[PDB]
Amino acid sequence: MEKHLFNLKFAAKELSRSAKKCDKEEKAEKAKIEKAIQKGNMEVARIHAENAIR
Amino acid sequence: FKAERLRVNLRLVINRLKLLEKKKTELAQKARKEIADYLAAGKDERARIRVEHIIREDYLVEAMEILELYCDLLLARFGLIQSMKELDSGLAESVSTLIWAAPRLQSEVAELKIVADQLCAKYSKEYGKLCRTNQIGTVNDRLMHKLSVEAPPKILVERYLIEIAKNYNVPYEPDSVVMAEA
């Protein structure tokens, strides 16, 4: 019975960690957008903006 | 047919139509962005038929909403429907509207089909077979037209083109020959 408890806690901490990554990537992606639109590129700026949002 | 099947399937149908509704709204929005791209560069006509696809998905949104409603209604009085062998005045609508909406929406949602059977066989009163085909005239007509597939009158289409043109701020010159007539 313990096995399932441990898998649930594991899945929880798992989801937290992955969420944390996606957030970190989000910030990095803002930065990357700024570098992008600094050139004047309106396409790369698009798909970067998009990936930031998602 | 069983009761629990009917209940569980109704709840799953509500969830399903919920997510599917929200998603169809977002998809519609994005495609409207596409319209805004067309009208600012290329031909009007292409944009026009494209927004006919738009008006289709919109009608599906609305339809799914009202149908969702009737589902929820049947789920609320569901305590009652487990008793009478005859549908009473209150449910005399949503029964027909939901049953009849099966063959249209079956592709988007299968659970709607299974529910359609679950009700269909609970009634030997004017449901199933030719009797089923003959009780389905009495459904909600509004839902019937919102759902039914026919090309919209071009004035409506061109209206949408006006609005879409406006929101993203592109100049558009709607034919003055259409506005005169209906």
Binding site: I33, E50, A52, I53 | E26, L27, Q29
Partner: protein, 53 residues
Amino acid sequence: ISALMDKFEHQFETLDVQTQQMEDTMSSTTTLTTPQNQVDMLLQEMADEAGLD
């Protein structure tokens, strides 16, 4: 050779349509997680202040 080459054009042309199709369904399945409105306001957000730092 020349035959092999127009065959080549046609071939990777089909590659491109495969690509396009794939990305349409692939981007219309996850599309709940990327609203259009949100992206608009974001891109604008980083538009006005873009080079101001």
